[PDB]
Structure formats: structure tokens, C-alpha cells
Amino acid sequence: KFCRFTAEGVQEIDYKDIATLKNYITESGKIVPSRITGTRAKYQRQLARAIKRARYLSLLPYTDRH
Amino acid sequence: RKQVSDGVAHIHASFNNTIVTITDRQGNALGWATAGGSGFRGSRKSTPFAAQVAAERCADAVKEYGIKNLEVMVKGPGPGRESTIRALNAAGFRITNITDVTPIPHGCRPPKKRRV
Amino acid sequence: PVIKVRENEPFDVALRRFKRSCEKAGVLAEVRRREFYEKPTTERKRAKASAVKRHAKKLARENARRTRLY
Amino acid sequence: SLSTEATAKIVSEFGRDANDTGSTEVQVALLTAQINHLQGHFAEHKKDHHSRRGLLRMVSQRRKLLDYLKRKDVARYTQLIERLGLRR
Amino acid sequence: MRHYEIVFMVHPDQSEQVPGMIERYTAAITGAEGKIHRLEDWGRRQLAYPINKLHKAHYVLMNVEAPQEVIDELETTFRFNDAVIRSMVMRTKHAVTEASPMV
RNA sequence: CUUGAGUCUCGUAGAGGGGGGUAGAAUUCCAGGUGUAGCGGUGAAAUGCGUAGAGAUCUGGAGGAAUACCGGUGGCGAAGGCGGCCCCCUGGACGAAGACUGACGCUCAGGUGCGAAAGCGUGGGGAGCAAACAGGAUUAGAUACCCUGGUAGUCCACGCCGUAAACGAUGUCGACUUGGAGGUUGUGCCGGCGUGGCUUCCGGAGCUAACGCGUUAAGUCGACCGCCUGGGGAGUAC
Numbered sequence: 001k002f003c004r005f006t007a008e009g010v011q012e013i014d015y016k017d018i019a020t021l022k023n024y025i026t027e028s029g030k031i032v033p034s035r036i037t038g039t040r041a042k043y044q045r046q047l048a049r050a051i052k053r054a055r056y057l058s059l060l061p062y063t064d065r066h
Numbered sequence: 067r068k069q070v071s072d073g074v075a076h077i078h079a080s081f082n083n084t085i086v087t088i089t090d091r092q093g094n095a096l097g098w099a100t101a102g103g104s105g106f107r108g109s110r111k112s113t114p115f116a117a118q119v120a121a122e123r124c125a126d127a128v129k130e131y132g133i134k135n136l137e138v139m140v141k142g143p144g145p146g147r148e149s150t151i152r153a154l155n156a157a158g159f160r161i162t163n164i165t166d167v168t169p170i171p172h173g174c175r176p177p178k179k180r181r182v
Numbered sequence: 183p184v185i186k187v188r189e190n191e192p193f194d195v196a197l198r199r200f201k202r203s204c205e206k207a208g209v210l211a212e213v214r215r216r217e218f219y220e221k222p223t224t225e226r227k228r229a230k231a232s233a234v235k236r237h238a239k240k241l242a243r244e245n246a247r248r249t250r251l252y
Numbered sequence: 253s254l255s256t257e258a259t260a261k262i263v264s265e266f267g268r269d270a271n272d273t274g275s276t277e278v279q280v281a282l283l284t285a286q287i288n289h290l291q292g293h294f295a296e297h298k299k300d301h302h303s304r305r306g307l308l309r310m311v312s313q314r315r316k317l318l319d320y321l322k323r324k325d326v327a328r329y330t331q332l333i334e335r336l337g338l339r340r
Numbered sequence: 341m342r343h344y345e346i347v348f349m350v351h352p353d354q355s356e357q358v359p360g361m362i363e364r365y366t367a368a369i370t371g372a373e374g375k376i377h378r379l380e381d382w383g384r385r386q387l388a389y390p391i392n393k394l395h396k397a398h399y400v401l402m403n404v405e406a407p408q409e410v411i412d413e414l415e416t417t418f419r420f421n422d423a424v425i426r427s428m429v430m431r432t433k434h435a436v437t438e439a440s441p442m443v
Numbered sequence: 444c445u446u447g448a449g450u451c452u453c454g455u456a457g458a459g460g461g462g463g464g465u466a467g468a469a470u471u472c473c474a475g476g477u478g479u480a481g482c483g484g485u486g487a488a489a490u491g492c493g494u495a496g497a498g499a500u501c502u503g504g505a506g507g508a509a510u511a512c513c514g515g516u517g518g519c520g521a522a523g524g525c526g527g528c529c530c531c532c533u534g535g536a537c538g539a540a541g542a543c544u545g546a547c548g549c550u551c552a553g554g555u556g557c558g559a560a561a562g563c564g565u566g567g568g569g570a571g572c573a574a575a576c577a578g579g580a581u582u583a584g585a586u587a588c589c590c591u592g593g594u595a596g597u598c599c600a601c602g603c604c605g606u607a608a609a610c611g612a613u614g615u616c617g618a619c620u621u622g623g624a625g626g627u628u629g630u631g632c633c634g635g636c637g638u639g640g641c642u643u644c645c646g647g648a649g650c651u652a653a654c655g656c657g658u659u660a661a662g663u664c665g666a667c668c669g670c671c672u673g674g675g676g677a678g679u680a681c
């Protein structure tokens with residue numbers, strides 16, 4: 001648990017921040033549920049938007065079999 | 067007749083059958099064997115044992131290329147997933163890596179549910 | 183679920199590491215879930231039924247802790 | 253919705269003070285300004301039923317405010333609907 | 341004038357045009373009294389997946405405030421420019437004069 | 444007159460809606476390479492596909508449709524419904540500090556609009572799926588269930604239809620009446636203590652024929668509307 005975005009007081013999860021985003025996807029590239037990471041509901045949504053937004057720019061992968 | 071020493075095994079494990087194709091790293095097939103063509107029909111064909119025999123025959127089919135290391139790419143939900151990888155090791159190949167390449171739509175409408 | 187076999191690693195445990203990685207990815211369930219079409223009416227009837235049954239077992243467990251069998 | 257600029261141009265032009273944002277005249281002029289602006293939106297987006305429902309509430313709200321103004325003092329009512337170019 | 345964050349990635353073979361295209365886009369925005377709040381050149385990076393068989397691309401990030409009409413010509417210019425293989429224009433609430441987590 | 448109703452100012456969350464663009468996965472088709480005897484399917488088979496080289500595997504292309512994970516008795520919408528990402532246009536809700544108008548309200552027969560899916564019209568598109576249809580089985584028979592195919596249709600634009608177990612089987616608005624456990628989204632003060640909105644489960648009095656509902660009432664009341672009067676005939680005939 002212990003959402004790390006309330007803890008760090010983030011205002012937007014900032015898809016360009018690939019260092020953070022890689023902590024919230026699995027080895028195969030799927031978004032990890034807020035139930036597992038204990039992210040708040042509000043930030044989990046912004047996290048999913050940032051991850052999909054980074055996947056489009058090829059900063060992150062969609063799958064592991066590209 | 068050529069010597070490669072470095073091939074890729076493609077296990078195609080469906081609910082009804084298992085197909086093992088050993089290709090080189092470039093994706094050109096060297097040989098293949100199936101559970102159905104290994105003397106198994108119907109109920110037998112879709113067992114883990116039928117896939118093991120299929121794996122051994124495919125290893126026996128590519129013996130003239132002298133493959134030494136073998137990547138294993140497993141596809142499908144079939145009962146012949148795990149037992150086919152063991153049989154490749156039992157033959158005497160070196161499994162360098164094992165991957166699941168089962169295609170997942172992120173797609174088309176699937177067929178209707180069977181009312182059995 | 184890409185497992186690269188490591189040095190001095192026995193085969194079986196790498197085969198154990200592979201079985202783990204595919205289950206954590208839930209690919210086998212994902213394939214079985216996509217083989218027949220599921221109506222939106224039924225996916226919702228199931229989701230709901232899952233939640234209400236997930237809920238009921240929690241309260242049943244909370245309650246059974248305040249009980250004696252003998 | 254309308255910009256704060258335009259809202260302030262209406263408040264000052266129709267209210268007797270810049271703080272008189274609640275007078276019937278200001279409200280009717282504010283709704284009329286947004287009703288007229290949306291005519292261009294629905295000339296291109298005829299299949300926008302959800303946004304048109306909010307528009308018809310401005311039409312209904314403005315009608316209820318004019319009917320109130322008419323029976324309280326006609327002098328301000330007739331002076332207002334001519335500035336806004338309303339049939340009634 | 342609205343705020344926009346533009347991230348466009350360029351073909352690695354025409355990275356030498358990357359310095360050139362920036363001033364042309366800068367001139368177009370600054371021609372229309374638009375500001376440029378940020379402008380970072382990420383250079384060449386490794387792609388997460390192949391894009392038009394490319395494995396690297398030249399990423400350029402800029403934050404601007406322009407009238408929204410001007411951004412359209414940028415979007416049209418990115419569209420017909422075969423140097424640009426992918427782009428993204430996004431509205432931002434305020435000016436973003438900081439530094440990307442990539443620098 | 445200001446407490447109901449509304450306006451203005453700052454912000455928040457959201458699959459609210461309409462238009463345009465785009466991405467990745469997968470299916471199918473096409474062309475080619477490697478390769479060779481099966482594939483597929485089932486309870487089991489057969490139809491079917493395959494030596495005219497299938498299936499498997501790799502490469503390039505075309506195309507359409509839907510957006511895995513996130514995803515949640517989570518959110519938004521009057522309801523129907525709404526789910527990749529980006530932009531443009533647009534609706535509503537909520538919250539904080541005031542100011543403003545000055546009860547300006549509620550309900551609403553007739554009227555008006557919106558209204559799943561199927562269906563209809565005109566013009567497109569058509570991958571996958573799939574009524575009809577064809578074949579293979581199963582069976583006493585099997586106008587089915589199962590299998591292999593497969594056309595309307597499903598998709599787009601515009602127009603019509605106007606119905607659903609369109610359901611919370613619970614009309615709308617307002618006031619009042621012990622609690623507990625959550626979710627979600629604001630906000631004030633110092634993880635702690637408040638205060639709002641929406642929402643899920645349990646339960647008290649009360650109510651109910653009972654099941655149950657229970658501050659989101661099916662409790663106590665007020666305002667207005669809709670509707671019922673044994674079953675069938677019949678939501679049928681004219």
C-alpha cells in the first residue's frame with residue numbers, strides 16, 4: 001500500500017517521467033493494479049493516462065513481444 | 067544437410083492438438099512433428115503424453131542439422147505446453163530461453179458460447 | 183513472459199520459473215476468457231456476482247471468528 | 253460557457269452596478285448571450301442531443317425570468333426585450 | 341492563447357535537420373506573438389518498439405503558448421513532413437518552464 | 444424580507460455529448476521464403492481444408508472492426524447509455540469565500556423532445572461474428588442443441604421506427620426520524636479533528652401479508668401527476 005504520489009505530493013504524473021512509470025508496469029508491460037501497488041484511485045487514473053501516453057511515444061512498450 | 071547448431075522450437079499447443087516446429091533463428095523451418103501424426107487420434111491426440119511423443123519425433127526429424135542450443139517459443143493454452151518443453155530437454159538440446167508468445171487481442175468478436 | 187535461462191541453472195527450476203511467469207501474467211486465463219463471446223449483460227452479471235460473493239465471504243469470516251464450534 | 257470578459261461586459265451593460273450580477277435583466281442578458289452563441293455550435297453539431305438539453309434549459313430559464321419580470325414591472329421588461337431583440 | 345506541449349520525434353537519418361526545423365517552428369509561433377516557454381532537444385534515443393522499421397528517433401520537446409489556430413499549421417506541418425515520424429500536441433493548464441525528467 | 448429558487452467570481456473530478464486525427468495488439472485475406480503430411484473439429488466423428496504443398500514458421504502488404512492490462516457493488520449522464528490516446532466544439536454536477544436578485548417555487552393532463560437492440564429506406568463499407576441457408580452428425584424423429592461453412596445484419600452518413608425484464612419490477616419535489624462499516628470527489632484546521640456532494644453493504648425503531656425496506660425508506664408527513672379494480676377472452680377485435 002502507501003500510495004507514493006500523495007506521499008510525494010505529485011500534481012501530475014508526467015508521462016515523460018519514465019523513471020517513475022517503469023515501477024508501475026509488469027515485466028511484460030501491463031499496468032499494475034492499484035490494489036497491488038496501493039496507489040490512490042485519483043493517481044492511479046493519471047498513472048494509466050501517463051503510461052498510455054508514453055506507450056504512444058515509444059518511451060514505454062505496449063507488450064513484451066514487439 | 068546444413069549445420070546450424072542454433073534453432074528455435076515453436077510449440078503450438080491447442081486444446082485439440084500440439085504442433086512442434088523447429089526453425090532456425092531466421093524463422094525457416096527445419097522439421098516438424100504433431101501429436102496427431104504421432105499415432106494419436108481423438109482423445110489421445112490432446113493429451114500431454116501425445117505432445118511428448120510429438121516433441122521427440124521433431125527432435126528426431128532435425129537430427130541431421132546438428133542443433134545444439136534451442137530457444138522455445140510456446141503458444142496456445144493446450145495440455146501439451148509443459149510436457150513438450152521437457153521432452154526437448156530429454157532429447158539433449160540446451161534450452162537457452164523459454165517464452166510465451168500466445169497472441170492476445172488488445173480485436174475481433176469471438177465465436178458464440180457453446181450450449182452443450 | 184520471457185524467461186532467459188541463467189548460468190549453472192538446472193532445467194526444471196527454470197521450467198518452474200517459466201510456469202510462474204506465465205501465471206503471474208495470467209495469460210492462460212486470458213486465452214480461456216477470450217475463446218467464446220461474452221455478452222455485456224453476462225459479464226456484468228458475473229462481475230456483480232463476484233463482488234457480492236467476495237463481500238459475503240469476508241463478513242462470514244469476520245462473523246465466524248466470533249464463534250465457537252464446541 | 254461565456255468568457256468572464258463577456259460576462260463582465262454584460263454585467264456592467266445591464267446591471268445598475270458591476271456587482272449586480274443577480275438582477276433579472278443581467279440573468280436574461282447572460283442567458284441570451286449564451287443561447288445565441290450556441291446557435292453556431294448546433295448548426296454544425298445537430299446530433300448533439302446531450303448538449304442541446306442544456307441549451308433548452310437556458311431557453312426555459314430565460315422564459316421563466318421574463319415571465320417574472322413582465323408581471324413585476326412592465327417598464328423594465330419592454331426596455332429589456334428590445335435591447336436583446338426578443339419577440340417576447 | 342492556450343498552452344501546448346509538443347513532443348515530436350524525427351527520423352534518425354535527418355537529425356541534422358532537427359536544429360533547423362526548430363527555428364522554423366519557433367519563427368511560426370513567435371511570428372504570431374506566441375511564446376516559447378520550454379524547448380528541449382532529447383537527441384537520439386532508443387525506441388521501445390519499431391516505428392516504420394526504425395529503432396531510434398530524435399525527440400524534441402517544446403512548451404509554447406500560442407493562439408490555437410497557429411498550432412494547426414504545426415500539426416499540418418508535422419503531418420506532411422516525412423522527417424517527422426510521430427508527434428503529439430497536448431493542452432497544458434499553465435506554462436511549464438522547468439526541465440523534463442529526461443534532462 | 445431572505446432561509447426556497449437563481450446569477451457572478453476561483454477551482455475540482457468525470458467512459459457526459461458532437462466532430463476530426465492517430466497508435467498498438469489480434470483475426471482474416473493477398474504475395475513470397477523454409478518445410479512436409481497432415482490440419483481442423485468433436486463426447487466420438489464426419490463434413491471441410493491439404494501433396495495443385497496445407498497446417499506450422501518467417502517477411503512484406505491490404506483491410507475492417509473492437510480498444511487487453513489500468514478496471515474497481517469505480518466514474519459521468521434525465522433516461523436509453525458512455526471505455527485506447529490527442530485536439531476542436533459543447534452540457535451538466537460539486538466545493539470554498541463572499542456579493543447580487545428577491546420566493547421569482549413545485550408538479551404537470553394535452554403538447555414537445557430524447558429514447559437499447561432488432562428492423563426499415565438511400566448511399567457506402569464488410570475483417571471477425573452471424574439470423575436465413577447448405578452440408579456433417581446426434582436422434583425413433585432432431586425443421587434443434589454440437590460441427591463445418593455462410594448471406595442479410597452487425598460498421599459509417601442521413602432519414603424512419605418508438606418498442607425492451609426501457610427494472611430499483613420502487614413517479615417527481617420538499618421536510619423530519621437511532622447507528623455501524625466502506626468507496627469516491629472537494630474543502631477547513633492541526634497522520635489527527637471537522638465539514639460538503641455522490642455512492643455500496645449491514646442493521647434499529649417504524650412499516651410490511653411475508654419476503655423484506657430501513658436517513659438514497661417500502662418510516663412520519665405535505666404538493667402535484669400517472670395508474671389499478673377477479674382469471675381467461677385480450678393489450679385482442681373494430
Ligand SMILES: [Mg+2]
Nearest residue numbers: 177178180217
Ligand atoms: Mg469453435
Ligand SMILES: [Mg+2]
Nearest residue numbers: 253254450535
Ligand atoms: Mg451556470
Ligand SMILES: [Mg+2]
Nearest residue numbers: 551552553554
Ligand atoms: Mg404526457
Ligand SMILES: [Mg+2]
Nearest residue numbers: 560561562597
Ligand atoms: Mg440498430
Ligand SMILES: [Mg+2]
Nearest residue numbers: 562563564596
Ligand atoms: Mg441498413
Ligand SMILES: [Mg+2]
Nearest residue numbers: 564565566567
Ligand atoms: Mg445499403
Ligand SMILES: [Mg+2]
Nearest residue numbers: 177178573590
Ligand atoms: Mg453455427
Ligand SMILES: [Mg+2]
Nearest residue numbers: 523559609610
Ligand atoms: Mg437497461
Ligand SMILES: [Mg+2]
Nearest residue numbers: 226608610611
Ligand atoms: Mg438493471
Ligand SMILES: [Mg+2]
Nearest residue numbers: 609610612670
Ligand atoms: Mg411498469
Ligand SMILES: [Mg+2]
Nearest residue numbers: 645646656657
Ligand atoms: Mg437494510
Ligand SMILES: [Mg+2]
Nearest residue numbers: 677678679680
Ligand atoms: Mg394492437
